[PDB]
C-alpha cells in the first residue's frame, strides 16, 4: 500500500524557518510526481510547491516563491521542503500529495495526512 | 475509384422558371384559415433555376455554391440522384449527406466521407435478369468521425416510372442557420394535370442536424442506368434554386395546409397584397412603402495624423502617483 506519513510540524515565529518530511513508501518514487499542499483554517486546498519526476524542475506559488525550498531524496525516497522567511498568514495544515502521472492528462493527487503547522506569535 | 467519366461533355447551363415552387412550413405551429405573414430565407417566385439534366453522354456535375441555402428538385423515374457532398474546400474537413436508397431501405449515412472526385453508383446488366442490383459503391468507401446516421422507415417503392409523362417528383430545401441543417422536404408525385410543375405544393421539415461547419460549396451524387464504360448518364433531371431573405404571405386553408402563397417583393401588385394582408385587392390607389435609393460605399475621412499618443509614458510609467493627488495626463 502507498503510505505518505508526514512529520516535522508545530509552531513558528513570523520570519522563522521550518522543514517538512513525508515518509513515502508503496510506490516507485520517481514514477510519481511530488507536491506540497496546504489547507488554511477557513479556506480550501492550495498548492505551494511542485517538483517533477526526476526533480529537475522546482516550481513555487507566487505567494511563497523565492522563500521556500523544495527538494527530494533519491536514496530513501522521502519528500522534503525547507520553508524559510516565514509569514504569519501561512497558518495551514501542510499535506503531502503525489500525482499518478498517467498519460499526462489525468491528475490523481494521492493526498496524505498532513502535519498541523500554526504561524502565530 | 479515381477514374473520371469516359463520355463527359460540356453543355451550357440551361434555365427554366420556378413558378411558385419552394414554399416550406416555417414552423411547427398549426394554423387554420388565416393569412400568416412570415420572413425567412425563401425561394423567390418566377426566378431562374438551373435545369441540370442527365441525358444520352451529355452531363456535368459541377461544384455549386451555397450562398444562403439551396432548393432542390428531382424529376426521376429511376432513383439516380442519391446524395449531397457539402463543405467549403471539399475535403475530410466537412460532413456530407448521403441517401444511398438502394431499392431495399432508406439507407442514410451522414459522416465525414473519404473524399471522391467523380463519384457514382450504378445499376447494370439490364438486357436480361436485372433486378435493379448495384455493385459500384464508390460514392462512399470509409468514414472516420461518423457523428450521425439515421434509417427512416421504408416508403412506397415506386419502381413504376411511366415513360413520357411527368409524374414522379421530389422537392427539398437545404439551409444552414447556426449549425443547423433545417432540411425541408416534400415527396409529391404529381398527377398529370398539364405536363409541367404548375399549381402549388408546400414543403415541411424532416430532420435537423447539429453540425456546425462553414459551407460555401456543394455537389450532388450520381448513379447510372440504361436499358461507365458502356454506360451513360441515366434519364432524369435535377433543379437548383437559391434561397433569399424574402417575405411571404401564406393562406392556410380550412384543414391547415398552405394552399396559396404571396411573395411580397415580386411586383407592386403583390406588395399591395402583402400590405393589405389579402389575396384580393379592390379598386383604388394604395400606398406600399418608401422609395429607398441604395447606398454605394463607405467613406472614412480621419485627419492625417501619424505620430502616436503617449501611452507608453502613461500605461508603463516609472514614478507613479496616489489618490491624494492624481496625475491628469493630457493626450
Amino acid at each position: 500500500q502507498l503510505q505518505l506519513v508526514e512529520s516535522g510540524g508545530g509552531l513558528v515565529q513570523p520570519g522563522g524557518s521550518l522543514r517538512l518530511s513525508c515518509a513515502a513508501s508503496g510506490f516507485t518514487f520517481d514514477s510519481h510526481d511530488m507536491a506540497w499542499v496546504r489547507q488554511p483554517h477557513g479556506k480550501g486546498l492550495e498548492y505551494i510547491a511542485t517538483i517533477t519526476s526526476v526533480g529537475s524542475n522546482t516550481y513555487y506559488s507566487d505567494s511563497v516563491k523565492g522563500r521556500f525550498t523544495i527538494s527530494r531524496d533519491n536514496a530513501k525516497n522521502t519528500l522534503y521542503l525547507q520553508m524559510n522567511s516565514l509569514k504569519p498568514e501561512d497558518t495551514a495544515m501542510y499535506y503531502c500529495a503525489a500525482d499518478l502521472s498517467t498519460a499526462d492528462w489525468r491528475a490523481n493527487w494521492a493526498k496524505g495526512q498532513g502535519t498541523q503547522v500554526t504561524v502565530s506569535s | 475509384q479515381c477514374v473520371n467519366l469516359t463520355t463527359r461533355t460540356q453543355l451550357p447551363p440551361a434555365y427554366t422558371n420556378s413558378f411558385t415552387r419552394g414554399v416550406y412550413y416555417p414552423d411547427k405551429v398549426f394554423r387554420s384559415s388565416v393569412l400568416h405573414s412570415t420572413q425567412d430565407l425563401f425561394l423567390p417566385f418566377f426566378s431562374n433555376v438551373t435545369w441540370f439534366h442527365a441525358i444520352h453522354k451529355r452531363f456535368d456535375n459541377p461544384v455549386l455554391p451555397f450562398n444562403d441555402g439551396v432548393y432542390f428538385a428531382s424529376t426521376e423515374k429511376s432513383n439516380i440522384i442519391r446524395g449531397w457532398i457539402f463543405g467549403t474546400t471539399l475535403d475530410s474537413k466537412t460532413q456530407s449527406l448521403l441517401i444511398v436508397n438502394n431499392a431495399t431501405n432508406v439507407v442514410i449515412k451522414v459522416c465525414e466521407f473519404q473524399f471522391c472526385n467523380d463519384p457514382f453508383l450504378g445499376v447494370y446488366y439490364h438486357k436480361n435478369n436485372k433486378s435493379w442490383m448495384e455493385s459500384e459503391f464508390r460514392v462512399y468507401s470509409s468514414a472516420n468521425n461518423c457523428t450521425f446516421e439515421y434509417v427512416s422507415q421504408p416508403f412506397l417503392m415506386d419502381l413504376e416510372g411511366k415513360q413520357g409523362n411527368f409524374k414522379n417528383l421530389r422537392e427539398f430545401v437545404f439551409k444552414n442557420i447556426d449549425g443547423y441543417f433545417k432540411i425541408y422536404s416534400k415527396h409529391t408525385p404529381i398527377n398529370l394535370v398539364r405536363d409541367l410543375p404548375q399549381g402549388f405544393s408546400a414543403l415541411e421539415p424532416l430532420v435537423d442536424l447539429p453540425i456546425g461547419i462553414n459551407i460555401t460549396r456543394f455537389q450532388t451524387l450520381l448513379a447510372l442506368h440504361r436499358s461507365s464504360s458502356g454506360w451513360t448518364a441515366g434519364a432524369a433531371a435535377y433543379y437548383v434554386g437559391y434561397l433569399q431573405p424574402r417575405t411571404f404571405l401564406l393562406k392556410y386553408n380550412e384543414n391547415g395546409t398552405i394552399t396559396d402563397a404571396v411573395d411580397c417583393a415580386l411586383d407592386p401588385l403583390s406588395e399591395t397584397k402583402c400590405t393589405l394582408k389579402s389575396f384580393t385587392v379592390e379598386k383604388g390607389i394604395y400606398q406600399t412603402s418608401n422609395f429607398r435609393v441604395q447606398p454605394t460605399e463607405s467613406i472614412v475621412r480621419f485627419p492625417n495624423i501619424t505620430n502616436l499618443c503617449p501611452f507608453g509614458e502613461v500605461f508603463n510609467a516609472t514614478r507613479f502617483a496616489s489618490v491624494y493627488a492624481w496625475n491628469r495626463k493630457r493626450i
Binding site: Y47, T50, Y59, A107 | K28, F30, D178, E204
Partner: protein
C-alpha cells in the same frame, strides 16, 4: 434526448463556480420542458469564464467559441485544478489564438492552416510572420487562480419550437374533458375547457394558434390525440336596481352567458337572476 432530466440535483450541488442561466431561471428547469438539449464540454483558462455569455468578446468568445445573442441556456463551470493540472503543464489542452475574422456561433474549427501574419505565404511551415494559430495551455497546479483550468459545460436547450423529447420529473395526471381545468400540456400552462377537436395535425406539429397567437389546440403527449382549448369565464355582471330611496331589491344581469351559475330567465343579453 429521450430522457428525464433532474435539473435540481445538478443545481443544488455547491461544486459549481458559475451557474448562470440566460433564457430561463434555473429553478423552473425542473418543471419547464424542452425539445433539443445540447451539452458542450470544453476546458478553458481561469478568468475566461467571463467570455462565455451571449454577446461577449475577447479571445475565447471571438475566435473559437461563440454563443448567439438569442441564447437560451445555462452555463456550468467548476474548478478542476486537482484533476487537470500537471507538474510540467498539461500540454494536452489547446486553443486557437489566431483566426482570420470573427467566428460564427456554434461552429467548430478544426483547421490547422498556418496563420499568415505578414505577406509572405508560409508554404506549410512556421517561422518569420508564420505564426501557428493553435497555442497550448500551461496547466500547472502552482499557477494563479486566473490561469487554473476550469471545466465548462454550456447547456443549451432548444425551447418552444417542436414536440418535446426531454422533460423533467413531473408525474402526469388523468385527462379531464369538457370541464374548466388548469392544464399543463408538456410545458405550457393554461386555463380552459378541453374538448375533442376536429383539427388534424401534421405529426411534426403540436400547438394550434389563433389570431392573437395563443395556444388554441394541442396534442396530448401521453396519448397522441388532438384537443381543443376553449376559455371559461364569459361576460360581465350588471346590477339592475331601482332607487335606493325606493327599495333595496336588486336584479343581476350576467351578460351573454348561458344560465350556468343559477327568478332565472334567459334574456337575449344574457342570464338574468332575480327579476
Amino acid at each position: 434526448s429521450n430522457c428525464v432530466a433532474d435539473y435540481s440535483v445538478l443545481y443544488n450541488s455547491a461544486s459549481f463556480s458559475t451557474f448562470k442561466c440566460y433564457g430561463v431561471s434555473p429553478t423552473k428547469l425542473n418543471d419547464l420542458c424542452f425539445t433539443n438539449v445540447y451539452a458542450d464540454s470544453f476546458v478553458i483558462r481561469g478568468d475566461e469564464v467571463r467570455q462565455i455569455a451571449p454577446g461577449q468578446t475577447g479571445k475565447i468568445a471571438d475566435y473559437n467559441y461563440k454563443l448567439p445573442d438569442d441564447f437560451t441556456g445555462c452555463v456550468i463551470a467548476w474548478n478542476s485544478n486537482n484533476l487537470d493540472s500537471k507538474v510540467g503543464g498539461n500540454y494536452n489542452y489547446l486553443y486557437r489564438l489566431f483566426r482570420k475574422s470573427n467566428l460564427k456561433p456554434f461552429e467548430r474549427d478544426i483547421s490547422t492552416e498556418i496563420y499568415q501574419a505578414g505577406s509572405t505565404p508560409c508554404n506549410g511551415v512556421e517561422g518569420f510572420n508564420c505564426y501557428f494559430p493553435l497555442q497550448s495551455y500551461g496547466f500547472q497546479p502552482t499557477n494563479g487562480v486566473g490561469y487554473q483550468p476550469y471545466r465548462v459545460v454550456v447547456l443549451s436547450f432548444e425551447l418552444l419550437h417542436a414536440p418535446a423529447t426531454v422533460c423533467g420529473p413531473k408525474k402526469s395526471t388523468n385527462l379531464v374533458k369538457n370541464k374548466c381545468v388548469n392544464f399543463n400540456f408538456n410545458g405550457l400552462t393554461g386555463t380552459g375547457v378541453l374538448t375533442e377537436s376536429n383539427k388534424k395535425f401534421l405529426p411534426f406539429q403540436q400547438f394550434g394558434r389563433d389570431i392573437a397567437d395563443t395556444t388554441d389546440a394541442v396534442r396530448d403527449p401521453q396519448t397522441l390525440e388532438i384537443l381543443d382549448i376553449t376559455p371559461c369565464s364569459f361576460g360581465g355582471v350588471s346590477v339592475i336596481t331601482p332607487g335606493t330611496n325606493t327599495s333595496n331589491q336588486v336584479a343581476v344581469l350576467y351578460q351573454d352567458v348561458n344560465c350556468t351559475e343559477v327568478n332565472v330567465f334567459q334574456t337575449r343579453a344574457g342570464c338574468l337572476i332575480g327579476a
